[PDB]
Amino acid sequence: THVQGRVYNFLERPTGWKCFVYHFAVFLIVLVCLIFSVLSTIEQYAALATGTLFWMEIVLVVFFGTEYVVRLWSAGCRSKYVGLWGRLRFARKPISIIDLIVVVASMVVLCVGSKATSAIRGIRFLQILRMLHVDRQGGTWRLLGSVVFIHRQELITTLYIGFLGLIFSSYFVYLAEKDAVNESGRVEFGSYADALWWGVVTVTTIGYGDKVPQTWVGKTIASCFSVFAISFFALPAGILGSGFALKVQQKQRQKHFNRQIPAAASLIQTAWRCYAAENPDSSTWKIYILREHHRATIKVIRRMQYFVAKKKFQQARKPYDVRDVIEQYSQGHLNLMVRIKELQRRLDQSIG
Amino acid sequence: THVQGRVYNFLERPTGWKCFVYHFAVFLIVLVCLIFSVLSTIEQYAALATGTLFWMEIVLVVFFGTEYVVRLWSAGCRSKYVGLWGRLRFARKPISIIDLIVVVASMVVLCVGSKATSAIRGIRFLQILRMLHVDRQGGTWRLLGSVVFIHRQELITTLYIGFLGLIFSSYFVYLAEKDAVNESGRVEFGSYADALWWGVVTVTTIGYGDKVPQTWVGKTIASCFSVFAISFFALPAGILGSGFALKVQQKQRQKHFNRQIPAAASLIQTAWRCYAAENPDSSTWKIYILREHHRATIKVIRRMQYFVAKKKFQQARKPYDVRDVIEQYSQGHLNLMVRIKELQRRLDQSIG
Amino acid sequence: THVQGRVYNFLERPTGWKCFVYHFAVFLIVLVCLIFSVLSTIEQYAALATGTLFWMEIVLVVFFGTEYVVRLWSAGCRSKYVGLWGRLRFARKPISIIDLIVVVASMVVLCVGSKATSAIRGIRFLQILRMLHVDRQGGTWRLLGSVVFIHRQELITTLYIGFLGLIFSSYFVYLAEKDAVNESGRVEFGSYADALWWGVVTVTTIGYGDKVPQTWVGKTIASCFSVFAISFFALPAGILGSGFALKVQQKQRQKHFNRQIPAAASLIQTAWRCYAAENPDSSTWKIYILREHHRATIKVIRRMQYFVAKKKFQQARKPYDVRDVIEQYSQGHLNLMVRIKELQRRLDQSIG
Amino acid sequence: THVQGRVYNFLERPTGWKCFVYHFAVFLIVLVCLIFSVLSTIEQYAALATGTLFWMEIVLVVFFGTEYVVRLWSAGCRSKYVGLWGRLRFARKPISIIDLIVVVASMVVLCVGSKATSAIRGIRFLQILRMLHVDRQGGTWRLLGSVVFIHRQELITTLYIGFLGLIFSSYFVYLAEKDAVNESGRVEFGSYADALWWGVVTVTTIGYGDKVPQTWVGKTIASCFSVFAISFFALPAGILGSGFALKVQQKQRQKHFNRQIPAAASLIQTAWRCYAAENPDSSTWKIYILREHHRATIKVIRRMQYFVAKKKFQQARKPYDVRDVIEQYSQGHLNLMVRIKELQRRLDQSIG
Amino acid sequence: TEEQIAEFKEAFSLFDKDGDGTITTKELGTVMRSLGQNPTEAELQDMINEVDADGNGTIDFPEFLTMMARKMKDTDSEEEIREAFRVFDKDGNGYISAAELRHVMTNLGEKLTDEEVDEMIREADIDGDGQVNYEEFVQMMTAK
Amino acid sequence: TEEQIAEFKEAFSLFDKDGDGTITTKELGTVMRSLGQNPTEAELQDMINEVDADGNGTIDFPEFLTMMARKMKDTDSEEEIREAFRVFDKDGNGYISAAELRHVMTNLGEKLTDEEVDEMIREADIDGDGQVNYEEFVQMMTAK
Amino acid sequence: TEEQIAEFKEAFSLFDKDGDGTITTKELGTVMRSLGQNPTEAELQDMINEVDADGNGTIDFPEFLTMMARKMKDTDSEEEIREAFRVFDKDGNGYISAAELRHVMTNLGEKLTDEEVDEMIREADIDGDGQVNYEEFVQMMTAK
Amino acid sequence: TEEQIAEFKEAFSLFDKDGDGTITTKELGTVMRSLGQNPTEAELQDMINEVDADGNGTIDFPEFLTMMARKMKDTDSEEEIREAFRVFDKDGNGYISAAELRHVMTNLGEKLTDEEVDEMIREADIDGDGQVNYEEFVQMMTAK
Ligand SMILES: [Ca+2]
Ligand SMILES: [Ca+2]
Ligand SMILES: [Ca+2]
Ligand SMILES: [Ca+2]
Ligand SMILES: [Ca+2]
Ligand SMILES: [Ca+2]
Ligand SMILES: [Ca+2]
């Protein structure tokens, strides 16, 4: 079946320009629905947008219901999704769960609200949840998650130290400004919660201005805290940006995809030979053509070869590095030395 | 003969100190015009600046028209711009289009508006548009565009996730602050549009302060959103800055321009030999001196040599990398092994 | 025998999931105490939170007092902490000092303040101090400190130049705005201290808005200062983030821990042989199978070998670099040349 | 003979801990003078600080006047500063000019003001200028300048594009908000100058809040401009921080200072041999031991050797790179091939 | 683990043959040639490097025990085998043609013999469809 | 394209001469020497590397077909030839002197024969003015 | 002092035996073989590289004096020896087993002789406990 | 500059002899050995690399002219010589001892002859003080 694979490539792994146009049109219609949701809150546009909302939501719920069914049927092209259990394995993905929730809640809203505040809050939140539909493969989420996980120790360090600085500076400014009254007669720092709110707003470099220290002690503490602890909250962006740039730069020194074909074939062959060694009557035993004690030796040599193949396949999928140069020189020097030893042995044997 | 090229190098691709002085003077007088336009909006300086504007704009439109004509004539020094179609190819460029528009609209304004609000709005926009005249080659735009295109996946990921966080946090803060009334009796969060405005101002770390959450739920949501989603909007600057620094660092390991002369000559020669192989009566067939079936083999060997020449020219234009070390070692080891094999062969031939 | 080691690994160097769960629970209970401290300042929650604080503080002071004693006993598993002097050497660590202070001040407060404003301020500060208990090994502090120390010259340069810019711009804006009166009749820039406060808030990109220049000279100076001197205060975050990313990238090219076993063994052996050369009747003198004047030469050769072993151990603990490639090629080329010299010498000796 | 050098190393190139303590004390006394200047502007502390300022300024002007003379005398230890013209060469340096200005203006102020507004403004600015005295060698300024110059194209690109975006967005927001009146009846955007002030404050992420767009068109334009053009102004900090981190990382792969001793000696020797070739009766002509026409060839071979020595000295002062590996392999492969050719030639001569 | 240590020691002794207590490149190559494989010196060095942890260039009994203590049923090993199989997966649907699999197995890498390639195809046969599923293949390979 | 496959198979068989189904450096060099080229081993390895995709060191019929299916009329190929020509463009106006072009062609790279260099100059002749326009040369070369 | 200079000059003369004023790899190897150590050329080059500062490939008297003027009692040297000892520390508590220490010393690196290994164990014996403390070992090693 | 091109062509012809129009490592070494310097092949390749721009491995007349058209009186050359002199400057005050300069010149790098070292010291003698100023040395060296 090739039609199933073609529609699966159209829907879940788009490539070309037609699929991009289709997905872009879906994104635009979802964005227009979100804009209408925004306009529904305004007083003058409340009635018109809500009146337009009903038919737009009917059209979208029918379209997405049809497309979900088409996609779930087309999932059978893959091997993990063949059969009933494969279909309900497809349904357990987070993106498919979100797609099902958005559609089922849409029908529930259309069937219950049509018969208040909740009846419109639900649909407003549902057309906000539809923006997750853009990323079908989760590529953006995986790209962010890999870099976040790699720099997790640095991120945790910066967050922890920044939180400590925030807590301590907020307490000190609260002590300095506990009783102060500004213009218009209002105590801006009436509690440690107010001090913490001021500290968060200041350390995130927002600075609304609704709470400002007014004593000289508070201003000095705020000056030092703003100078120092702000960098601890600006650090994660720099760490993640430099990481992203470093991965992008490393993408230019990647080995060609055809360079791992022999390594992958060798890994499969070595793994299967290790597997087939477990059969006493296997046909893999005639490679060594009586054989009674050689089996224990062969099963060890095969395991060693399998480990070597694993190492080679691991190395074939990495970008170029100094380790590659070192290994290449080691192998070349060993081969050259072996050749010169062969020359010496031949000369000594022939002429003495 | 060379006067056209000299004036083209003066105008289009400045180099030296005279051209730099000319371009700097043009930039200064354009900036003075912009400052006068700014002063024209002030009540006291409206009359004086506008009175000074007329003669300055007449002088500028005449000078820029003459310089545009001179540049268009001098464009024929190149080979792409020779002739009528070459001139309209030069005029089609975006910078030449902007230059033509700024001049023609300047004459139109000076001939229609001179003899109310639009007649000065247009001239102000036109002298705002004159600052694009500084970059004749588009070097800044190309430098930005290359780095933006290279890091496009990371930029799209950060923008998409930041937009999602903005939308969701704005909705939650709107729900938390829908009915709250601050001092002076004003509902700051009266709609999701107001919540979105607050979210943009907060997530971009501006913090005007015209909309601040006033409930504890809203303040907690704003605290978490400010801590987290702000980095997602500060990320693009870090990504692009690290990219720029990485390109600058890579500029110090570039191969000398003279190292690609043999490679370029070889590429041209191989491409022309592949082209000339298509002629049965060509004079390129006497290199291999009845030739009937050798031609099918020669046309394949020449294509292979052309591909090798393409590879070598591509490698000659890149900075040094680990791939260069690996290729150099491979070639050297192969040559050494061939030499030792020749030693063995000679010894066996001579002494047996 | 080993129970002391198991409990030390449970407490001071946690590994696994049980220790992580224990430490996470401790962190959560400390955070709950901090939240109760925040709620104690609010008027409505003042009575309930303070009433709940007493029992929770008693429970925590007993738990931490027991755990401190258990940990101090368990410190004897190591060799530096064996015995009485080892225990008081453990007690001198900053983290142990903080742990002792938090408990002793807790008992002092519960025994004196319980039997006032200070009696609550002190306990609030003490349960603020309990957040330092999370980092037992100081890993975050050491990770920050290493990168800060490495980039110390750049950090000092940026801080010094930013401070100079802040001082000069604040003085100029003070001169420009000394006599200005804004709306509501209040001189925002009444002194150089006010100008400095404005400068700090502006250069840290906070911008509360309580002090804004109102003259055109002040606005122009503020515009230039904001455009330029702000980057000098945003620089440290970028420097430290790029440094963190560079260390993380360098972590992927580290040599395996088993590669330094021969180097470490060789360093120990060479150091001990240098030490044992000092004994005239030592048994290390029989390596050379009387011996009167050879001792002065042996004691020098051993020192040279010790220095070589030190170099090898230093190199074995570093990540891969171009120096490794250069040294490997040097050694391999020397060996190959020696082998070819042996070939030539053998041929000339045998045949002449 | 060495006293002058010792005091010069004490003053201009401090090293150790005594010189560091001296310079630290000078920095602290200058900072205390700056704090007193700040306190002199405050109304309550105006009299006391000004009264204390007289004696402090007298003591400092005498100390700095004595130390300037001591330093100028001690400058003769170097070779560039020997003699009268050397002393006026030392005095011409920017730091020495600043030191002379701060002292002469101090004496002038203390002799004229003591015997109104300007008489205090000048001395306040003079104690502000004393902070430049800390950096005697200009190390921070040179470190900043090198990195700024290296990334000059990127910095210019970002600044130019950000300026264009600021200008255009300010004009569009001015058009959108020209006639709008906020609460309290005040036109925040009364002119393009006001729009430009708003644009600078917004694009630098300060956000005072004294000017905020109030129409939906203005808010939309401000939202897009804040999202995009802010990164163009945050870029320079990222570029410079990544550059600083890259230089710091490059500092760990620097060659030892002793690797350039032979190269420097060879460069000096080759340069002097090229110089001495110009003398027909020189004693450098006996190296080739009459000689009539060999001079033209010798003077060319010497020039070639000088160029090679220049290249080697340039390479010896750089950190390790891929070029070093490539050159090392090229030389080693050439030597090995020459050795194998020698083997072949010897064998063929002997037996063939 | 009496039997396990006994058989591992017997296997180690079948490689050592010297009583030294270390297995070298020469001894490994000698045994391999006794089996009839004439391995290259580079191949033998690669074989030794994996087992050898300390870095002295030989294999001690602790290293032999550590290497024999591994398992191919590991989740990472299964993922590695699947990723190796994905290189020859053109469509990406988890199926590889029987003819392409046979060609790759016989002509690339270790160059498996025809009889063992047919044995693998018999084992990895989804009712003789002709487009073998390489996920169940890895499943039963790692099942052991 | 059945005729194209037939001619490609004929050329592959002419290169092979062995019936194995792969082309090695030895066979490629043998044919090149039969034509009178005496190529270096490094040159032969470089020639093999481009065509060889799988990495086994030889050329199969699919690899031969893929290599024969390429084109020099590609836009990237045209831009590459123009960039190669710009290395000898002193000004940047798209013109290169006939004498300089002849010197470069005869004395650098593949060292074209004088007769074929004059043939190239005849083909790229802007009315014999002596300053050839190298963009028209690439235009005609890529037109095939 | 003058005695130190005199003995260092005597040692330098013993190494040189030539009066040139420089020590080369050939001379160092000659003396080492006179002691009976047959060092490798790479080993001799490594030995020369540390002492040789200027980089000319030999050892002058100032370089010899600088090398002899060092000391193993340095804090960095003590920390380095401790770090080397921590590689064989399993628990991390500052104790290394006597059997493991003996095996490592005899079978790794310079391969110390059995008699000197027993001498070290006698020196590094905390009342014959069997789990030697390697901190006091480094302490007394760096004491002199 | 007809005379300049004249003697440059004369020198190029003296180096060439073969008449081809290029100078190779073999010809350069032949002339150098005719002068009596027996240069190494690596040295000859290094000498050729600087002059050779096109990269063909030889030296054409334009390359020879470009190399002969340089100058040692350049500001960068003067700064380079000063930086080379600063390596042996201990204090950093711009003075280097006569004995240290003589030792470095005779024993490092090109290993200048004693007679020319004394000639240099005579030229670089500030009234026979014994602590020569290496700035005036470079100043008059670059004066030419
Ligand atoms: Ca052996
Ligand atoms: Ca081992
Ligand atoms: Ca074949
Ligand atoms: Ca094949
Ligand atoms: Ca020419
Ligand atoms: Ca020496
Ligand atoms: Ca000849």
Numbering used by the authors:
A (entry chain G), B (entry chain A), C (entry chain E), D (entry chain C): 104 to 218, 223 to 396, 506 to 568
E (entry chain H), F (entry chain B), G (entry chain F), H (entry chain D): 6 to 149
What wording appears in the published article?
The KCNQ1 Kv channel, also known as Kv7.1, is the pore-forming subunit of the slow delayed rectifier potassium channel (IKS) that plays an important role in the repolarization phase of cardiac action potentials. Importantly, KCNQ1 and other Kv7 members are regulated both by membrane voltage and the signaling lipid phosphatidylinositol 4,5-bisphosphate (PIP2). The voltage sensors close the channel at hyperpolarizing membrane voltages, while PIP2 is required for the channel to open. The human KCNQ1 channel was purified as a complex with the structurally obligate subunit calmodulin in the presence of Ca2+ and reconstituted into liposomes composed of 90: 5: 5 1-palmitoyl-2-oleoyl-sn-glycero-3-phosphocholine (POPC) to 1-palmitoyl-2- oleoyl-sn-glycero-3-phosphoglycerol (POPG) to cholesterol [wt: wt: wt] with 300 mM KCl.
From the unpolarized dataset, the best up structure (C4-symmetric) had an overall resolution of 2.9 Å. The up map is best defined in the TM domain, with local resolution estimates of ~2.4 to 2.8 Å for much of S1 through S6. Density for individual hydrogen-bonded water molecules is visible in the voltage sensor. Tightly bound phospholipid and sterol molecules are also visible at both the outer and inner leaflets of the membrane. The up structure in lipid bilayers is very similar to the depolarized structure in detergent micelles. The six positive-charged residues in S4 are positioned as such: R6 (R243) lies below the gating charge transfer center. H5 (H240) occupies the gating charge transfer center consisting of F167 from S2 and the negative-charged E170 and D202 from S2 and S3, respectively. R4 (R237) is directly above the gating charge transfer center and interacts with E160 in S2. The pore radius is ~1 Å at S349 in the up structure, which is notably smaller than the radius of a hydrated K+ ion (~4 Å). In other words, when the voltage sensor is up, PIP2 can bind to this pocket and promote channel opening.
